[PDB]
Amino acid sequence: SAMTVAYIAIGSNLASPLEQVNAALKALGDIPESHILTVSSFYRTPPLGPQDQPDYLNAAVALETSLAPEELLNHTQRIELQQGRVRKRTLDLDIMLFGNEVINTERLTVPHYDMKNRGFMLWPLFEIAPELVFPDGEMLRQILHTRAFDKLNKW
Ligand SMILES: Nc1ncnc2c1ncn2[C@@H]1O[C@H](COP(=O)(O)OP(=O)(O)OP(=O)(O)O)[C@@H](O)[C@H]1O
Ligand SMILES: N#Cc1ccccc1CSc1nc2c(=O)nc(N)[nH]c2[nH]1
Ligand SMILES: [Ca+2]
Ligand SMILES: [Ca+2]
Ligand SMILES: [Ca+2]
Ligand SMILES: [Ca+2]
């Protein structure tokens, strides 16, 4: 079966997160039937949320894969857990896009339900996929031209 390009958001806001992120990239690259095509720059983003916490390291990866979408989710969940993610964050791997697919299942909603509202997703995505068009036809470039998002600082 043909390869699909999936786009995965990476976040960590450990007080020291660069090692989580680099370990995640290595793990993502070892996923079967999959290969990293591109990685964005790393960005330092102020934390969104009510609690006092460290800044996030945010990034995006393009992963070419012939896995089924839920199978890719199995791997991203395994990586988060194997890197010490404990639910009450060490690592967060969100599947933003899985080619052109629109998925609404119990475990998996693609496109990511809020990504069009998140500069820390859209800017890294634009760096690696400037010509991207969403499944509904919206162009990434047009969203970033029109809507107000802060620019990100590099990590
Ligand atoms: N596109 C997706 N990528 C990753 N997980 C997803 C996706 N869609 C649904 N899920 C499901 O989301 C559940 C909750 O994950 P999580 O607690 O990481 O949310 P979050 O990343 O903190 O918040 P947000 O989604 O608003 O960024 C997972 O158990 C997983 O089954
Ligand atoms: N509440 C909350 C909330 C508010 C906006 C977006 C996402 C969340 C969900 S938790 C969260 N994740 C990240 C991240 O990856 N990067 C930054 N900068 N802030 C973050 N907050
Ligand atoms: Ca998540
Ligand atoms: Ca998230
Ligand atoms: Ca919002
Ligand atoms: Ca869409």
Class of residue 7 by CB neighbours under 10 A (exposed 0-12, middle 13-18, buried 19+):
buried
Ligand 2 atom at minimal distance to the Cα of residue 92: 15
Give the domain CATH number at 97.
3.30.70.560
Q: Where are the beta strands (DSSP E) in 13-135?
A: 34-39, 43-45, 56-65, 92-98, 103-104, 109-110
Residues 44, 52, 78, 85: which is the catalytic one? Answer: 85
Domain range enclosing 60? 1-155
CA distance linking residue 54 with residue 69, whole number of Å = 31
List the structure tokens of 85.
């993610």
Structurally, how many domains does the chain consist of? 1
Within 8 A by CB and 6+ apart from 24, the residues are: 10, 12, 79, 83, 91, 93
Residue closest by Cα to atom 16 of ligand 1:
92
List the structure tokens of 66.
């012939």
List the structure tokens of 31.
């996923």
Instruction: Provide the resolution (angstroms).
Output: 1.8
CB 143 within 8 A of CB 132: no
> In angstroms, what is the span from residue 94 Cα to ligand 1's centroid?
6
CA distance linking residue 42 with residue 60, whole number of Å = 8
Cβ < 6 A, ligand 1 pocket = 92, 94-95, 107-110, 112, 114
CA distance linking residue 130 with residue 126, whole number of Å = 4
Residue closest by Cα to atom 28 of ligand 1:
107
